[PDB]
Design a protein around this ligand. Sequence first.
Ligand code: A1IPU
Ligand code: A1IPU
Lengths: 261, 258
Amino acid sequence: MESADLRALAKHLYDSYIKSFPLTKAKARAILTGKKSPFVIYDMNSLMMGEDKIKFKHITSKEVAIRIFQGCQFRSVEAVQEITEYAKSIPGFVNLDLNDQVTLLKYGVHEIIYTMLASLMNKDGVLISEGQGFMTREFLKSLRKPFGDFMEPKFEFAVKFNALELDDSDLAIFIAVIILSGDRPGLLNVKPIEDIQDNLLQALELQLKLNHPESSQLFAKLLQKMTDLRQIVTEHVQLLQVIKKTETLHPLLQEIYKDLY
Amino acid sequence: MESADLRALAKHLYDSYIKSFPLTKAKARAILTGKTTDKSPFVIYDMNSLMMGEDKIEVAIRIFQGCQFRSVEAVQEITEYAKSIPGFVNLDLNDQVTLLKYGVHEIIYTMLASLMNKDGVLISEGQGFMTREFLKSLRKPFGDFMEPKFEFAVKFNALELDDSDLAIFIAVIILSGDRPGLLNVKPIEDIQDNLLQALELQLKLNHPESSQLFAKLLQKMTDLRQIVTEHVQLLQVIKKTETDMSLHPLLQEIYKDL
Ligand SMILES: [O]C(=O)C1=[C][C]=C(C2=NN(C(=O)C3=C(Cl)[C]=[C][C]=C3C(F)(F)F)C3=C2[C]=C(Cl)[C]=[C]3)C(O[C]C2=[C][C]=C3O=[C]OC3=[C]2)=[C]1
Ligand SMILES: [O]C(=O)C1=[C][C]=C(C2=NN(C(=O)C3=C(Cl)[C]=[C][C]=C3C(F)(F)F)C3=C2[C]=C(Cl)[C]=[C]3)C(O[C]C2=[C][C]=C3O=[C]OC3=[C]2)=[C]1
């Protein structure tokens, strides 16, 4: 006497996920498998050609590794706003205390950006600019100093996450579960947050059983990935703090990126 | 993939848990909630009571070594329990070691919660109770080393698991295919899938009113991973101050490359 409601919730989230995000996993997989050919960035010279060709919006430090890093930051700021908009479509979310809405987004966005970045990645590289560009793993990993080692962990996660072979309809519910985490620091009213999460968890369970009937305990396996997510976001923050203390932007830019650096 | 067999696995693990671990949650809760004359613990809440306690059943170090001794015994008990998990002893021996190496700390924390309430922890097989305020007020780094165990336990215990639930939960933790340096992930995940199926049915039957308890329990495996990380880091920092500190080889070996 709830199954229909769970399927309704799944479809509602799917529909909103398609509206909120620029490039779906389905579209990104078509591009990556070669099934409208993207510009490939595999080295310095092709980077320089790519910024002319694929019309990047973050280019104004002239050093390459920094300009790539900054472009990741620029795209992360856009994703935060797309996730924020997506969250508003989650049933019950806008009815929560306003401070709790801000807390949930603040502590959730990093985990969601990682998850969704996996949709744009394979073992060889990552889609950029809505699938119009493709930057190689080897190029990113081979950037100097801390920057190479900052990039590679994202791929290491993606490769593992992608082995679950989730589609967009699965991810739309998963992302919602992450946002509605009752254990975030400083939440004023945990009860309604866990009540919503319980519904989303039910919807994700049924979704995964219907969409992947042959993949046993996929639900559990997906929940275990929340462990990898928490871990890598912690590492992330630590790597950023090291970048800050070593690398020597306009105060307004600093202010725009304060959340992500 | 057949309930009868999932229930059979749950009974097997429960029975083995009872054999391997001295002090169950059921017994600990009976001691903590009291109402009984026969099982009443001596309570240690300060230095004098500690002194009387040692007659009846540096201070921060002696307490630390008390915790350490019990952790070593726990590793031994967990190791014995692991062998009873169907399929575990059949795995590559290196993987066996790796699963125990990365699994034992998460299990110690989980099972320590059974011995705790918000005000303290059972010790000496339930014959003692040492207060949280005493432990937290130990000097230097030691106070802050003790307190996070209680902070976890309070949250974990809110789930109200019983021993029959924990037996399966602990098995799930051990059979984690994502541990670093595992040679053969597949047969580990095959066992885990069975344990997960057994856990899900156990929780549905034993807690039918508790919605998505399965999912909430798996989300606690996230807390565990993080708390073990912090534990290891703080223990490493305590080593670089304390020479009067020494770790049993079993623990020392687990911490190398943890
Ligand atoms: O959904 C998308 O389209 C999306 C989402 C995330 C990234 C991306 N973010 N990021 C972070 O570190 C990061 C991450 Cl996970 C999480 C939070 C904050 C940050 C941060 F710190 F930035 F604020 C990365 C990222 C990608 C890589 Cl490969 C490595 C690190 C992204 O990146 C596209 C991209 C690649 C090379 C370029 O080179 C120039 O512009 C580029 C844009 C896309
Ligand atoms: O199953 C049990 O019976 C059990 C299991 C774990 C502990 C315990 N360990 N520990 C550690 O740090 C610790 C932990 Cl989690 C894991 C690995 C290594 C260590 C270590 F670092 F030791 F090597 C603690 C522990 C307890 C607290 Cl409250 C705080 C830290 C335990 O402790 C009972 C105890 C309390 C006060 C006393 O005071 C004298 O003896 C005592 C025994 C029991």
